[PDB]
Design a protein around this nucleic acid. Structure first.
Ligand code: CA
Ligand code: NA
Length: 276
DNA sequence: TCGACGGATCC
DNA sequence: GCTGATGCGC
DNA sequence: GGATCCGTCGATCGCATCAGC
């Protein structure tokens, strides 16, 4: 059945108003999506920090609109080493960070342009586009390697500041995170492996699935639909885009939103509200 | 994802 | 620029 | 032996690149 995201709760569990509005979007071609009036949708949602994945854009092919984006002056970008047009993530924010880094500190995993780290006063923000195990599970073995190393990079970070991790994590965590769980229990993003890696990341770092913390039993809540087979219209999809945060931050959690209506990609955008 | 495909097996 | 083709994504 | 069950297994869509001239 269809899904309707409830209104934005902009109040913390202790009655404080939200201060920070992070918005993440797997854009699936930075150039297509801009052409598709995506940056329009950004201008109206008005985030403080905007994280994007699947940029598929070279450092010199980025449209000019982006730099001119108001309210998001500090703009950091990572694209892969030698695979032109693959992968790519960005992070834009109204305020300027204290330190920004790229990658997770592992040569094997920092070559496809997938991780940006943005340290602020009161927390650290990590945005990432995770490797898909692949059609035919061709890269599932490597995705076990990435999950393990990403796990311990975040455990590290977490020990020093409150962490917020967002973006496309390329796994549906539980049968409630996708419309066709039985049809997909051995395809990319729903294998016993990928799902055990998500749960291990949650127990080890540790982190909470922000959206599920609030709506732990609401189904058909998705962030991705295959372009094929007019699937978005039928609401057959996968929740692949998360905000994961340290338990420390749960008193600051006001709301975790899924922007189902916003068009421009095969992912829809997601939006986090914090009282900081 | 979706159907067309099997091949199993059920009355 | 314009045509073919192939790669990668759930 | 007819009609169901239930596991494969190609191909829709879209956004990129690359070869060639
Ligand atoms: Ca391929
Ligand atoms: Na009978």
């Amino acid at each position: 059945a269809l899904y309707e995201d409830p209104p934005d709760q902009k109040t913390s569990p202790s009655g404080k108003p939200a201060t920070l509005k992070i918005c993440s979007w797997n854009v699936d071609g930075l150039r297509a999506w801009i052409k598709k009036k995506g940056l329009d949708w950004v201008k109206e949602e008005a985030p403080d920090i905007l994280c994007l994945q699947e940029t598929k854009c070279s450092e010199n092919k980025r449209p000019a609109e982006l730099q001119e984006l108001p309210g998001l002056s500090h703009q950091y970008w990572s694209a892969p080493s030698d695979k032109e047009g693959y992968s790519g993530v960005g992070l834009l924010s109204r305020q300027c960070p204290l330190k920004v880094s790229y990658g997770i500190g592992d040569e094997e995993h920092d070559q496809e342009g997938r991780v940006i780290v943005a340290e602020f006063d009161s927390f650290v923000l990590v945005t990432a586009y995770v490797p898909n195990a692949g059609r035919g599970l061709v890269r599932l073995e490597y995705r076990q390697r990435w999950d393990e190393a990403f796990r311990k990079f975040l455990k590290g970070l977490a020990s020093r500041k409150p962490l917020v991790l967002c973006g496309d994590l390329n796994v549906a965590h539980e049968e409630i995170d996708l419309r066709n769980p039985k049809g997909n229990k051995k395809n990319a993003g729903f294998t016993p492996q990928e799902r055990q890696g998500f749960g291990e990341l949650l127990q080890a770092v540790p982190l909470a699935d922000s959206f599920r913390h609030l709506y732990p039993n609401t189904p058909y809540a998705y962030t991705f639909w295959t372009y094929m087979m007019n699937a978005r219209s039928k609401n057959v999809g996968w929740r692949l885009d998360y905000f994961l945060l340290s338990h420390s931050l749960l008193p600051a959690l006001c709301d975790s939103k899924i922007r189902s209506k916003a068009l421009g990609s095969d992912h829809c955008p997601i939006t986090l509200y914090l009282a900081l």
